[PDB]
Enzyme design. Structure first.
Site, PDB file in Angstrom:
ATOM      1  N   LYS A   1       0.649  -0.851  -0.074  1.00  0.00           N
ATOM      2  CA  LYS A   1      -0.224  -0.778  -0.162  1.00  0.00           C
ATOM      3  C   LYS A   1       1.235   1.300   0.276  1.00  0.00           C
ATOM      4  O   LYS A   1       2.387   1.157   0.291  1.00  0.00           O
ATOM      5  CB  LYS A   1      -1.092   0.227   1.158  1.00  0.00           C
ATOM      6  CG  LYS A   1      -1.668  -1.476   1.111  1.00  0.00           C
ATOM      7  CD  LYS A   1      -2.904  -1.372   2.730  1.00  0.00           C
ATOM      8  CE  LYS A   1      -4.205  -2.664   2.342  1.00  0.00           C
ATOM      9  NZ  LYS A   1      -4.883  -1.382   3.058  1.00  0.00           N
TER      10      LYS A   1
ATOM     11  N   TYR B   1     -12.308  -3.125  -3.319  1.00  0.00           N
ATOM     12  CA  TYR B   1     -12.785  -2.808  -2.074  1.00  0.00           C
ATOM     13  C   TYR B   1     -14.242  -3.142  -2.260  1.00  0.00           C
ATOM     14  O   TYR B   1     -14.978  -1.971  -0.949  1.00  0.00           O
ATOM     15  CB  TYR B   1     -12.221  -1.781  -1.640  1.00  0.00           C
ATOM     16  CG  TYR B   1     -11.212  -1.761  -0.942  1.00  0.00           C
ATOM     17  CD1 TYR B   1     -10.484  -2.863  -0.113  1.00  0.00           C
ATOM     18  CD2 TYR B   1     -10.374  -1.211  -0.976  1.00  0.00           C
ATOM     19  CE1 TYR B   1      -9.257  -2.638   0.200  1.00  0.00           C
ATOM     20  CE2 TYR B   1      -8.596  -0.817  -0.929  1.00  0.00           C
ATOM     21  CZ  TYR B   1      -8.688  -1.934  -0.470  1.00  0.00           C
ATOM     22  OH  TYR B   1      -6.912  -2.207   0.331  1.00  0.00           O
TER      23      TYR B   1
ATOM     24  N   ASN C   1      -2.226   0.042   7.139  1.00  0.00           N
ATOM     25  CA  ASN C   1      -1.399  -1.337   7.458  1.00  0.00           C
ATOM     26  C   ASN C   1      -1.090  -2.072   6.453  1.00  0.00           C
ATOM     27  O   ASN C   1      -0.346  -3.227   6.066  1.00  0.00           O
ATOM     28  CB  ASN C   1      -2.741  -1.967   7.915  1.00  0.00           C
ATOM     29  CG  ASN C   1      -3.562  -2.439   6.810  1.00  0.00           C
ATOM     30  OD1 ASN C   1      -3.602  -1.743   6.076  1.00  0.00           O
ATOM     31  ND2 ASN C   1      -5.464  -3.137   6.747  1.00  0.00           N
TER      32      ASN C   1
ATOM     33  N   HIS D   1      -1.655  -4.910   1.419  1.00  0.00           N
ATOM     34  CA  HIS D   1      -3.009  -5.952   1.291  1.00  0.00           C
ATOM     35  C   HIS D   1      -3.114  -7.457   0.810  1.00  0.00           C
ATOM     36  O   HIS D   1      -2.250  -8.314  -0.163  1.00  0.00           O
ATOM     37  CB  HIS D   1      -3.476  -5.184   0.227  1.00  0.00           C
ATOM     38  CG  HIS D   1      -4.674  -6.133  -0.228  1.00  0.00           C
ATOM     39  ND1 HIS D   1      -5.967  -6.347   0.001  1.00  0.00           N
ATOM     40  CD2 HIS D   1      -5.087  -7.216  -1.807  1.00  0.00           C
ATOM     41  CE1 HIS D   1      -7.112  -6.789  -0.590  1.00  0.00           C
ATOM     42  NE2 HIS D   1      -5.949  -7.609  -1.548  1.00  0.00           N
TER      43      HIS D   1
ATOM     44  N   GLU E   1      -9.175 -10.247  -8.482  1.00  0.00           N
ATOM     45  CA  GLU E   1      -8.219  -9.096  -7.923  1.00  0.00           C
ATOM     46  C   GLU E   1      -6.996  -9.283  -8.774  1.00  0.00           C
ATOM     47  O   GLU E   1      -6.870  -8.409  -9.063  1.00  0.00           O
ATOM     48  CB  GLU E   1      -8.008  -9.494  -6.292  1.00  0.00           C
ATOM     49  CG  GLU E   1      -8.808  -8.319  -5.283  1.00  0.00           C
ATOM     50  CD  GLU E   1      -8.798  -8.789  -3.489  1.00  0.00           C
ATOM     51  OE1 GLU E   1      -6.905  -9.313  -3.991  1.00  0.00           O
ATOM     52  OE2 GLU E   1      -9.549  -9.150  -2.986  1.00  0.00           O
TER      53      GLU E   1
END
Ligand SMILES: Nc1ncnc2c1ncn2[C@H]1C[C@H](O)[C@@H](COP(=O)(O)OP(=O)(O)O)O1
Ligand SMILES: Nc1ncnc2c1ncn2[C@H]1C[C@H](O)[C@@H](COP(=O)(O)OP(=O)(O)O)O1
Ligand SMILES: Nc1ncnc2c1ncn2[C@H]1C[C@H](O)[C@@H](COP(=O)(O)OP(=O)(O)O)O1
Ligand SMILES: [Mg+2]
Ligand SMILES: [Mg+2]
Ligand SMILES: [Mg+2]
Lengths: 151, 151, 151
Positions: free
Chosen positions: A11, A51, A114, A117, A128
């Site tokens: 990320k 998402y 965080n 992913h 994805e």
């Protein structure tokens, strides 16, 4: 031979904090195979689709703009059980709940930052992967150490 | 001055994948004392005895051939509770069940390619050590940092 | 802006075994902010106070002189949930009960030689920080990557 594949992304906080190599290193070390990798600042529209199951969550819009505000490393990793095992390697959704030894456990603090992913199921992974990669961008090759990773 | 001992071996996949130093380093860092080490490609028969309790499992003959097919690093490690702690450091029999932070958790995927062996009890440890080592090959010495590891 | 703070100390076995940098590095990697650090051999009397709630344990008198027998690194670290999270990063009180990946898990064997201390609550942390640091010795500052660690 083709094995299970998952989608992993570093990320923007991961890129910004210089954790790209460290994350990739962990996956090579584990014995998994890199099948695809690209480096992009993806569109808000792509992330909204990425998402989609959280579209109704209050943190969703901030999440989608944030994930598109900077470059990410998009990856596809291949190996037996790579979807669930990659998750274990990441830790939990919240770094606070992630154990030392995991990526989120060792490197970050908050759920919104965080750094990594990973697809949560073979079903999510297939979608994805198809979303982030064109079929051509997935490389078919044989890792020679494979015979020491797989019986 | 003599403490509990266990038998640890780096398996042929461990050797092939360049994990010998990495494995030993973890044991030095933990504070354990090296008591014996040799580097051999053992006979299929030595392995049959090593795994004698598994003689009736279907994976046993293949296990024994694989474990004698290339060189292994045979070690004896010494320290309080070293048998069970080494097990904790290795992870579970199946890498899939091994946590990040453990040796199998970080480096391998499949049960048949789990890079390291460790005795599962003091009694097994006593048998494995006598099998792989001659009494003369176990070195008695004092690590000077011991007083910072042991009260 | 201002977040939770905890007191972390590298104990004399930690200093002696050359683990100061390793420990600090683990906290920098996690994303926590250093607010204070000093290097001292503290007085038996300071330690008696540091461990006052343990005054009735049989190991209390041994503990306070050992913790005052050599130099320690006294630190104050700042960040969301840093009290409990620092504890997690340390492992459990007994290295025997600590997981691989934690500091005690990777580096120690005995409870009396468990190389690091951390406050067990926000309340104890407020007292320990105040015990070991003068208000002037605490640095308030902004880490520029803070915006990639915290929403
Ligand atoms: N309660 C929450 N508050 C703020 N941000 C959140 C959040 N839960 C998740 N986020 C962000 C961080 C997650 O990586 C991202 C996707 O959430 P998720 O799919 O439910 O978990 P995961 O990323 O482990 O698959 O959404
Ligand atoms: N179901 C299985 N299929 C193939 N190989 C297996 C297997 N179970 C075990 N092996 C191999 C890998 C193990 O490390 C080796 C020794 O078996 P074990 O004594 O039960 O486990 P451990 O190595 O955890 O002590 O046997
Ligand atoms: N049973 C015991 N025997 C010998 N030393 C002990 C001991 N229990 C604790 N010590 C030492 C090691 C501990 O880090 C220190 C402080 O004890 P504690 O406050 O109960 O736990 P902690 O250090 O995890 O916060 O005292
Ligand atoms: Mg998900
Ligand atoms: Mg066994
Ligand atoms: Mg305490």
């Amino acid at each position: 031979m083709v094995r299970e594949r998952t989608f992993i992304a570093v990320k923007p906080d991961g890129v910004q904090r210089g954790l790209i190599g460290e994350i990739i290193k962990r996956f090579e070390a584990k014995g998994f195979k890199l099948a695809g990798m690209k480096y992009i600042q993806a569109s808000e529209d792509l992330l909204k689709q990425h998402y989609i199951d959280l579209a109704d969550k209050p943190f969703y819009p901030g999440l989608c703009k944030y994930m598109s505000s900077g470059p990410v490393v998009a990856m596809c990793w291949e190996g037996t059980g790579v979807v669930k095992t990659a998750r274990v390697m990441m830790g939990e959704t919240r770094p606070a709940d992630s154990k030392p030894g995991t990526i989120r456990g060792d490197f970050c603090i908050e759920v919104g930052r965080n750094i990594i992913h990973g697809s949560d199921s073979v079903e999510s992974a297939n979608k994805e992967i198809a979303l982030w990669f064109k079929p051509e961008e997935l490389v078919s090759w044989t890792q020679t150490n494979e015979s020491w990773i797989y019986e």
